[PDB]
Amino acid sequence: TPTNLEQVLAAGGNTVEMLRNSQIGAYVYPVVAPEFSNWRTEQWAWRNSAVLFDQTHHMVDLYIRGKDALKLLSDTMINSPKGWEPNKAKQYVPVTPYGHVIGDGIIFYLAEEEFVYVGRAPAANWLMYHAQTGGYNVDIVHDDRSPSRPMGKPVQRISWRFQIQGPKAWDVIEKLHGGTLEKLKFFNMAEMNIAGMKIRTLRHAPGLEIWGPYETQEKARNAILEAGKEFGLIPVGSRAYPSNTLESGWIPSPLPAIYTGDKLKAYREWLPANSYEASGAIGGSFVSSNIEDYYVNPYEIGYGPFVKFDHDFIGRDALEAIDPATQRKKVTLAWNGDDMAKIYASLFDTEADAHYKFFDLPLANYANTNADAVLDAAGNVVGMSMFTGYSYNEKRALSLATIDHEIPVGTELTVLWGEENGGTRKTTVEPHKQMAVRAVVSPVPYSVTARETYEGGWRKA
Ligand SMILES: [Cl-]
Ligand SMILES: [N+]
Ligand code: NA
């Protein structure tokens, strides 16, 4: 039986068909209670009071130490390493030799020769592969995300990681600290007081990400919850937590673009057969027999400004060949509310042969990687919708998408919701029929945009 991704792909037929029919099940945000009050009030609180996000369990952590730690990062990231020093974090974005996004995550520069990566599995795997096979003088400690279904088992992480966010977040933070606390610039790191402990901070309406050794997790949680009551702070569960990004604009789920190309053959031979890459799933209406049509490059998902050709890095030549002006662009799509009502109404039709794909709330994704076709009035595919749910703050279904560069803000397109042929074999997919949902191109981060009218609907020139 296959022991690595390369063997999995060789034995598994068409790669798209494999991923689109994977049996992995839901992409789960583990361990944290689904809800503490209810997801609607929890969503409301991060806009109107304050929240504690529990980020301890859904991300892979990679502790990177040694003389070559910074070089490893520089060699593999599009980001400029110039001027980088401890107590500044970056959004680490690696591309392949072909210029496609592998993944992304937050890399903390904790001290000289000491970094930590926090993010989904794929960029951590890529980092580990280059540390292990590239001769770097570095030491790596990998700490997996928590199990999707603990079923009563104990769960252990090396660190706990929280965020305090919302309009009253700083009031809570200064109450915990015991006095005024300087608001540093975005992604600069410092420390604060919590219950007599020195807690390191990352500046994220200002808020903070905080972290510490797993063993002090409840001591920190309890102090934050107690201090925050005065300002209406509440804890957010795992049901509401992942939908925040629908408002903030970050696409979590680019397909790791590592399935083709002989410059990636050795990486595929290194990746385990039960890796995210080998075992994950793709969900949605976009169908191509070519897995490369699911790849994205940094310019398409908002990382263009990160690309700096001031250092050597994997894929630099391919990125230099890209014309930024013509690339797809990240947008928020605002889904039509009548169409949403029609999706949900179909669940209560006892006579219809089929209903529309179930749209879970507040997060509607049903695979690791999401890929719904976005269409114009002529049926041209003009975009790919990549993360989907609902905001109780806006009273709107929303999706994050990358679409053709020339499409004006305010354009009404359609998102094809659901899968063909009654559904793929994914275990998250009930039998259903498809629906074209009207959706209005809006900014990212989302803001309400007036729908523009075009005679006969907007279509490509
Ligand atoms: Cl995530
Ligand atoms: N904000
Ligand atoms: Na950067």
Curated annotation (Swiss-Prot):
Binding site for substrate: Y29, H58, R120, Y241, P242, S243, N244
Recorded catalytic activity of this chain's protein: vanillate + (6S)-5,6,7,8-tetrahydrofolate = (6S)-5-methyl-5,6,7,8-tetrahydrofolate + 3,4-dihydroxybenzoate; 3-O-methylgallate + (6S)-5,6,7,8-tetrahydrofolate = 3,4,5-trihydroxybenzoate + (6S)-5-methyl-5,6,7,8-tetrahydrofolate
Enzyme nomenclature, EC number: 2.1.1.341
Effect of R120A: Strong decrease in activity on vanillate. Loss of activity on vanillate
Pathway participation: Secondary metabolite metabolism; lignin degradation
Temperature-dependence annotation: Optimum temperature is 30 degrees Celsius with vanillate as substrate.
Pfam families recorded: GCV_T
The keyword Repeat belongs to this UniProt entry's keyword annotation: no
Site (Important for activity) residue list: H58, Y241
Outcome following mutation: Y29A: Almost loss or loss of activity on vanillate
pH dependence remark: Optimum pH is 8 with vanillate as substrate.
Binding site for (6S)-5,6,7,8-tetrahydrofolate: Q55, Q91, V118, Q163, E209, W250
GO BP annotation list: lignin catabolic process; methylation
Gene3D superfamilies in alphabetical order: Probable tRNA modification gtpase trme, domain 1
Coiled coil: none
Keywords noted in UniProt: Lignin degradation, Methyltransferase, Transferase
Effect of deleting the gene: Disruption of the gene leads to significant growth retardation on both vanillate and syringate.
Enzyme class: transferase
Subunit (UniProt): Homodimer.
Function description: Involved in the catabolism of vanillate and syringate. Catalyzes the transfer of a methyl moiety from vanillate or 3-O-methylgallate (3MGA) to tetrahydrofolate, forming protocatechuate (PCA) or gallate, respectively, and methyl-tetrahydrofolate. Has similar activities with both substrates. Cannot use syringate. Uses an ordered, sequential kinetic mechanism.
Family, similarity comment: Belongs to the GcvT family.
Protein name as annotated: Vanillate/3-O-methylgallate O-demethylase
Native organism: Sphingobium sp. (strain NBRC 103272 / SYK-6)
